[PDB]
Design a binder for this molecule. Structure first.
Ligand SMILES: *C/C=C(C)/C=C/C=C(C)/C=C/C1=C(C)CCCC1(C)C
Ligand SMILES: *C/C=C(C)/C=C/C=C(C)/C=C/C1=C(C)CCCC1(C)C
Ligand SMILES: CCCCCCCC/C=C\CCCCCCCC(=O)O
Ligand SMILES: CCCCCCCC/C=C\CCCCCCCC(=O)O
Lengths: 282, 282
């Protein structure tokens, strides 16, 4: 049922595998089960829900918050890819060391993670701003994925080496992200904007923290999850980190724009680093 | 000589391949030659030259031009990886569709390409600046690599689909890079700073243009190059785009710092978008 050799014969008391000389690659490890059909159905359900969310968001989404459009476009594009080839090469990489590495997921990360951190870097959406710290957020994060991908393709020790490399990059990514949220909390007005900024932080760290968690629980780690079981949990934290988080960031930037129009753009320097807090009256 | 099955037997008039049931994966396509030993030696030579350059640059390199340090660190780190596992999994991905995808290269791109575009975004190295356009440079470029990687792992039509996807992203990356160089040329002083800025542009577009060129010439494309023969040319444009280009960017930012100290930071608005040209006298 795949584009590689799946039918074979055992010979010489199980010490020889004979396969057809059809030109297809063959490995016994690739034929291990991805999981239970109860988990496959659970994954195929959330695939539509996330796809429906992405479509509802692209509908709903139609300053210019281009960041939300990009991850949503990439998301529902990926689900079109996923519906038709959720386990075909190269959506799933069946490598020479028997590793099934879900490159579809890690590619979607590389496409959307820096765009979320860009949205985080300009949480208020105000003007051509950002900072030098933004580059630290984007350079470190791409690192974690590249190491995390490399770890998933690798096996044994070097998987740990590259996972620990990606973990160290991930620690740098989380801290600089806290420095962004901390300032963003004290920059946005005292109203509901600070409620949604704090909530965006929780959605951020929780969902983002689960990615190295699911890497340890999944086949990439000690395999306490199935390949289907890893697709389920990943979809949940994908939904949290991408579609719901971009929604609040949209709801935040709306509350900012209204406040900026009604009360104007008013700044009151507050000490922490000096932040220009948005206020109501001059 | 690899971590996958390399010894096998033909049976039934060449219609059956029998392999040992040792648990190793097996594919006939993975056993195709990478190239000629004359080309392997040529690749192993430039590997040291690039490694020696990276070491000489890390020596030499020791505002804070952190960007040059990063690609140089990643480069000589990669050569340590390359010297020991230039064709082991997952430095080279032997996938179920017989594709050998050199993930070491594409990972090094993901690690260093956005850092070069960051250096390009702050060519003068002056202050916490950058722009919104920078995000277009970084989002588009990561796209080209992700599609280009996906194309290299893929086969046939979808390789073209993802290559054309990466090509469209690459066109966006090159244009916004020209807009950066064009402004950088008119921002830096009239002296030798404009010579080195123009030269950085030529090193940029030539070496960067060769990457989709070598993708078409290599096994990823019509295979007019060998796998070793692709390692040779890639090293050359790696050397150009990374070590030599970062050197000029260092020589540029030095000429800027001296000019800023001697003549001060003087701006004269010139029309193109309005650029604050660095001048000598007020
Ligand atoms: C939409 C998906 C997002 C925003 C995913 C973010 C994922 C990470 C930050 C993953 C990090 C990992 C580490 C820091 C350790 C190495 C393995 C991990 C990659 C999965
Ligand atoms: C140090 C290496 C660098 C800076 C490499 C840059 C490589 C590219 C911009 C490659 C681009 C490609 C396309 C635009 C078409 C798809 C395939 C390519 C990836 C290799
Ligand atoms: C782990 C070590 C650090 C990984 C992140 C490196 C980012 C460098 C850029 C930071 C900056 O100068 O803004
Ligand atoms: C190919 C289509 C475009 C790829 C690049 C998308 C980048 C969006 C960010 C641009 C910006 O708003 O600055």
């Amino acid at each position: 049922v795949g584009l590689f050799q799946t039918s074979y014969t055992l010979e010489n008391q199980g010490s020889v595998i004979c396969i057809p000389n059809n030109g297809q690659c063959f490995c016994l490890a690739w034929l291990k089960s991805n999981g239970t059909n109860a988990e496959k159905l659970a994954a195929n359900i959330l695939q539509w829900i996330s796809f429906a969310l992405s479509a509802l968001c692209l509908m709903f989404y139609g300053t210019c918050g281009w960041e939300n459009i990009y991850v949503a476009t990439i998301q529902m594009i990926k689900f079109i890819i996923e519906y038709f080839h959720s386990f075909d090469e190269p959506a799933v990489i069946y490598s020479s060391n028997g590793n099934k590495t879900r490159w579809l997921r890690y590619a979607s990360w590389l496409l959307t993670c820096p765009v979320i951190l860009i949205h985080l870097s300009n949480l208020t959406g105000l003007a051509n701003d950002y900072n030098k710290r933004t580059m630290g957020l984007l350079v470190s994060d791409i690192g974690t994925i590249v190491w995390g991908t490399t770890a998933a393709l690798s096996k044994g020790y070097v998987r740990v080496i590259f996972f620990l490399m990606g973990l160290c990059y991930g620690i740098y990514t989380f801290f600089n992200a806290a420095k962004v949220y901390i300032e963003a909390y004290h920059t946005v007005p005292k109203g509901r904007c600070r409620q949604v900024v704090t909530g965006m932080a929780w959605l951020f760290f929780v969902s983002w923290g689960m990615f190295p968690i699911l890497f340890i629980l999944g086949p990439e780690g000690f395999g306490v999850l199935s390949r289907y079981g890893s697709n389920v949990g990943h979809t949940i934290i994908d939904l949290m980190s991408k579609q719901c988080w971009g929604l609040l960031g949209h709801y935040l930037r709306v509350l900012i724009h209204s406040h900026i129009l009604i009360h104007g753009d008013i700044r009151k320097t507050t000490k922490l680093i000096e932040v220009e807090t948005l206020v109501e009256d001059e």
